[PDB]
Specification:
Elements lengths: L4 E2 L8 E8 L2 E12 L2 E4 L10 E5 L12 E10 L15 E5 L27 E5 L14 E4 L2 E2 L1 H4 L13 E4 L15 E6 L2 E10 L12 E5 L4 H10 L1
Antiparallel strand pairs: 1-9, 2-3, 2-5, 3-4, 4-7, 5-6, 6-7, 8-9, 8-12, 10-11, 11-14, 12-13, 13-14
The chain binds ligand SEI and calcium ion (CA).
The site of calcium ion (CA) has 7 residues, from loops.
């Protein structure tokens, strides 16, 4: 997250850290959202290669014991059928991970609330992106969870030529693009929390940024629109 600030410990209890076995240790590779005691929602591009993964809930500082963490292995990975590894702009960047065990919900570990199917946010809606990604374009990962206010840019504006053009589909959500705040490498798969009628709901799964850099004017961070995949999510969970 570029242009943000450290979040209050455990203030985004649905945020998870997706890590892979790097021989001797574990390395953070993507964010994610806990949606069931044993299911995590993330980006397909985070898990479309054969690696050994684990999920950390109740996390804040990646390098120190905070005393609120729970570590659990990933048992099954379900990538969206239409996803193509080499074509992020086509969309369908979403995947569900079935955990080896159910985590214990408490003050530090909670389920993210999903929007009703088909829900579309008004332009400039108040949202926040959270993650341990780079804090600067070509910078380094954040040790502690960061957050940044990232208001939505509606589809009509986002798909305009001065913005993303045809690269963005209606199955995506754009947010930010002021050249100051944005998602960045390592934030992928994480949540875009939007405040709707007093409650925060996870409207997006962090997907991609421009080749020009993370924080670029008129190049908002692009998210998979969660409300476009509600039926799929429900079907996968029920069949597995
Ligand atoms: C993660 O945290 C990050 N996500 C990414 O890095 C995503 C996944 C694959 C590539 N990507 C990008 O953001 C990159 N964007 C592109 O590759 C890209 C190329 C071209 C176009 C475009 O304008 N098009 C026009 C017509 O032809 C092609 C499409 C759009 C996008 C970017 C880095 C250059 C963060 C969310 C940034 C991660 F991927 F998991 C990571 F941790 F590995 F980084
Ligand atoms: Ca920790």
């Amino acid at each position: 997250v570029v242009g943000g600030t450290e979040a209050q410990r455990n203030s985004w209890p649905s945020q998870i850290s997706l890590q892979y076995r790097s021989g001797s240790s574990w390395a953070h590779t993507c964010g994610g959202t806990l949606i069931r005691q044993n299911w995590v929602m993330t980006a397909a591009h985070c898990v479309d290669r054969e690696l050994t993964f684990r999920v950390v809930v109740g996390e804040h500082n990646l390098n120190q014991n905070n005393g609120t963490e729970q570590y659990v292995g990933v048992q099954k990975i379900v990538v969206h059928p239409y996803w193509n590894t080499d074509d992020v702009a086509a969309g369908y960047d979403i995947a569900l991970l079935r955990l080896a065990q159910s985590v214990t919900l408490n003050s530090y570990v909670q389920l993210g609330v999903l929007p009703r199917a088909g829900t579309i946010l008004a332009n400039n809606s108040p949202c926040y992106i959270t993650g341990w990604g780079l804090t600067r374009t070509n910078g380094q990962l954040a040790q502690t969870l960061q957050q940044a206010y990232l208001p939505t840019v509606d589809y009509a504006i986002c798909s305009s030529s001065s913005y993303w053009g045809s690269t963005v589909k209606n199955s995506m959500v754009c947010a930010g693009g002021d050249g100051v705040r944005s998602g960045c490498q390592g934030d992928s798969g994480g949540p875009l929390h939007c405040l709707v009628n007093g409650q925060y709901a996870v409207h997006g799964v962090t997907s991609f940024v421009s080749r020009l850099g993370c924080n670029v004017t008129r190049k908002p961070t692009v998210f998979t629109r969660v409300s476009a995949y509600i039926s799929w999510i429900n079907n996968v969970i029920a069949s597995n």
